[PDB]
Amino acid sequence: KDENGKGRDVLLFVDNIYRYTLAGTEVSALLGRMPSAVGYQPTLAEEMGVLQERITSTKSGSITSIQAVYVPADDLTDPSPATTFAHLDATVVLSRDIASSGIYPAIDPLDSTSRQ
């Protein structure tokens, strides 16, 4: 807060937040943990929630967040993209078929949703 002033609106852009969990997978076994379903660490959901819960906006100040989320092997069922869905308000899903068809942007009109 600046005196005689209000809170400042803050933008936040993150690029491939998936790499954050990927870098946790690389050091998972070395920390002595049993691997989870595919190859991920057993603490995937918790270590994603701890990060994702600090991005919200509170009674003082507002944080508008844009995040690109990678999708391994074009598979929206993979544990990390499938875990990330619950933490977002508007989800824009890109498709490889549409991009290969020449349409840009490749936003899939049937998977894009929003609470708004």
Binding site: D75, T77, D78
Partner: protein, 69 residues
């Protein structure tokens, strides 16, 4: 009729004898009608039935294409 050729143009001509030849024209009528009936019996049964069954449930397979589960 011409001096060497007689040409008879008939609407419906059958080679049989009597006046009751409806009783023999009915045989051709029934045979051709049965063939035309069995045809539509085969058009629906073979073509339209199978060719929709094949296209019915393809989408359920293509969506799980990349899954590692």
């Amino acid at each position: 009729v011409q001096p060497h050729v007689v040409t008879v143009l008939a609407d419906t001509a059958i080679r049989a004898d009597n006046l009751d030849e409806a009783a023999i024209l009915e045989a051709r009528k029934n045979a051709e009608q049965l063939l035309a009936n069995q045809k539509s019996d085969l058009d629906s049964a073979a073509a339209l039935a199978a060719l929709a069954e094949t296209a019915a449930q393809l989408e359920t397979i293509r969506k799980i294409k990349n899954r590692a589960q």
